[PDB]
Design an enzyme around this catalytic site. Structure first.
Site, PDB file in Angstrom:
ATOM      1  CB  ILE A 116      -1.093   0.427   1.740  1.00 15.12           C
ATOM      2  CG1 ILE A 116      -0.789  -0.103   2.403  1.00 15.12           C
ATOM      3  CG2 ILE A 116      -2.519  -1.061   0.899  1.00 15.12           C
ATOM      4  CD1 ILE A 116      -1.586   0.851   3.515  1.00 15.12           C
ATOM      5  N   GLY A 117       0.174   2.535  -0.542  1.00 16.87           N
ATOM      6  CA  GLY A 117       1.124   4.013  -1.028  1.00 16.87           C
ATOM      7  C   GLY A 117       2.009   4.260  -0.824  1.00 16.87           C
ATOM      8  N   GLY A 147       5.424   3.225   1.546  1.00 21.95           N
ATOM      9  CA  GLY A 147       5.843   4.576   2.746  1.00 21.95           C
ATOM     10  C   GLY A 147       4.880   3.943   4.130  1.00 21.95           C
ATOM     11  CG  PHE A 148       2.032   3.731   5.501  1.00 20.07           C
ATOM     12  CD1 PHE A 148       1.142   4.864   6.286  1.00 20.07           C
ATOM     13  CD2 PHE A 148       0.906   4.132   4.248  1.00 20.07           C
ATOM     14  CE1 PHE A 148       0.983   5.718   6.440  1.00 20.07           C
ATOM     15  CE2 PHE A 148       0.664   5.327   3.783  1.00 20.07           C
ATOM     16  CZ  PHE A 148       0.419   6.578   4.723  1.00 20.07           C
ATOM     17  CB  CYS A 173       6.114  -5.721   5.315  1.00 18.15           C
ATOM     18  SG  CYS A 173       7.759  -5.585   4.929  1.00 18.15           S
ATOM     19  CB  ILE A 174       0.533  -3.051   5.344  1.00 17.70           C
ATOM     20  CG1 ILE A 174       1.137  -2.747   6.601  1.00 17.70           C
ATOM     21  CG2 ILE A 174      -0.329  -2.862   5.417  1.00 17.70           C
ATOM     22  CD1 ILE A 174       0.578  -1.427   7.199  1.00 17.70           C
ATOM     23  CE  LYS A 210      -1.540  -5.059  11.546  1.00 19.02           C
ATOM     24  NZ  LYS A 210      -1.432  -3.614  11.668  1.00 19.02           N
ATOM     25  CG  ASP A 249       1.556   6.787  19.530  1.00 15.34           C
ATOM     26  OD1 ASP A 249       1.170   8.148  19.879  1.00 15.34           O
ATOM     27  OD2 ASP A 249       2.314   6.298  18.862  1.00 15.34           O
TER      28      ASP A 249
END
Ligand SMILES: C#CCN1C(=O)[C@@H](C)N(CCC(C)C)c2nc(Nc3cc(F)c(O)c(F)c3)ncc21
EC number: 2.7.11.1
Length: 322
Positions: free
Chosen positions: A24-25, A28-29, A31-32, A52, A158
């Site tokens: 994904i993306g 940039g995020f 290992c998803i 994930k 968080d």
């Protein structure tokens, strides 16, 4: 090191079959990757799930998986939505998990819901402001999420815009993600004492984290509510008073302590004039009254925010206005 062959079929511990798509993306995020149920079709860019994957010795993925298995089962979530008369609940759906070996290394994987955009991207595209309407509607739903996780023995620690994601098919539903560093503050109904936990090395995100976290103690319920307070101010104004000194945690802590002791001075610093939204001050005063182990009166907090909506001529209609 590729963890998957694109298009491969993976089987979770409940023997449910899934197909893996692209990351994904633009990677940039981490290992998803996109995922879907096994079928003859390949996984498209509109896939309804993600997978994930991390090494089996990765601590955060194990923590996150235990949170979802313990606290976010369908029956628990649907029962809560029914009993509390909610439109929805922004806890992500956990679909399955397993172990995957590749090139002589062992990995763990988790199938979750695929979402749309995070709120941080939308916030920045809005020149770092959300409207009063938006902030109150976001915060009501976050209070629903926090009450739920708190009642299932966990705190998040968080909360922030980059950990808030929109339903892919409904831009009025916001979800709180990332439980990798979540904390089980109340295992089997026994509250953690007011002290450091050697097992935990995470202090949250410095600009938003709680005074408790700054003091080196394990996070509790009041801390989650405090974090949400700082988020609300950041979202409304584009700023927090301590944002130019985030490399110095003593400074950040000192400033939060001082502004907790004198909330009127916080409102004066963060808002123009005598033009502070009164519900934000009342919210923070109410959180200030919580002891470390104390159960929050979440409905009283929601009512405080609802008075803000009435003040601007609106109501809780679930419209995020993004
Ligand atoms: C495509 C697309 C949109 N899109 C993103 O652009 C980023 C912001 N991310 C990663 C957020 C992570 C880093 C929190 C996403 N995440 C999901 N799903 C998801 C659900 C969970 F419950 C998780 O725990 C999880 F990691 C991921 N679904 C879409 C996204």
């Amino acid at each position: 090191a590729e963890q998957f062959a694109v298009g491969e079929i993976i089987t979770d511990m409940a023997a449910a079959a899934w197909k893996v798509g692209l990351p994904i993306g633009q990677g940039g995020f981490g290992c998803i990757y996109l995922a879907d149920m096994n079928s003859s079709e390949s996984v498209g860019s509109d896939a309804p799930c993600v997978v994930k994957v991390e090494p089996s010795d990765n601590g955060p993925l194990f923590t996150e998986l235990k949170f979802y298995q313990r606290a976010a089962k369908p029956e628990q979530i649907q029962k809560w939505i029914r009993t509390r008369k909610l439109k929805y609940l922004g806890v992500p759906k956990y679909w399955g998990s397993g172990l995957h070996d590749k090139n002589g290394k062992s990995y763990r994987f988790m199938i979750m819901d695929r979402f749309g955009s995070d709120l941080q991207k939308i916030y920045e595209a809005n020149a770092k402001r959300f409207s009063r309407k938006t902030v109150l509607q976001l915060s009501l739903r976050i209070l629903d999420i926090l009450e739920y996780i708190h009642e299932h023995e966990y705190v998040h620690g968080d909360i922030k815009a980059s950990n808030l994601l929109l339903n892919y098919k409904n831009p009025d539903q916001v979800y709180l993600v990332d439980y990798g560093l979540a904390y089980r503050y109340c295992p089997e109904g026994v509250h953690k004492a007011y002290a450091a936990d050697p097992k935990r090395c995470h202090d949250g995100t410095i600009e938003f984290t709680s005074i408790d976290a700054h003091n080196g103690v394990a996070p509790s319920r009041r801390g989650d509510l405090e974090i949400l307070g700082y988020c609300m101010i950041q979202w409304l104004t584009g700023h927090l008073p301590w944002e130019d000194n985030l490399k110095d945690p003593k400074y950040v802590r000192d400033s939060k302590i001082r502004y907790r002791e004198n909330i009127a001075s916080l409102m004066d610093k963060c808002f123009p004039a005598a033009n502070a939204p009164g519900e934000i001050a009342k919210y923070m005063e109410t959180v200030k009254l919580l002891d470390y182990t104390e159960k929050p009166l979440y409905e009283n907090l929601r009512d405080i925010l609802l008075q803000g909506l009435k003040a601007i001529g609106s109501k809780d209609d679930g419209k995020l206005d993004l």
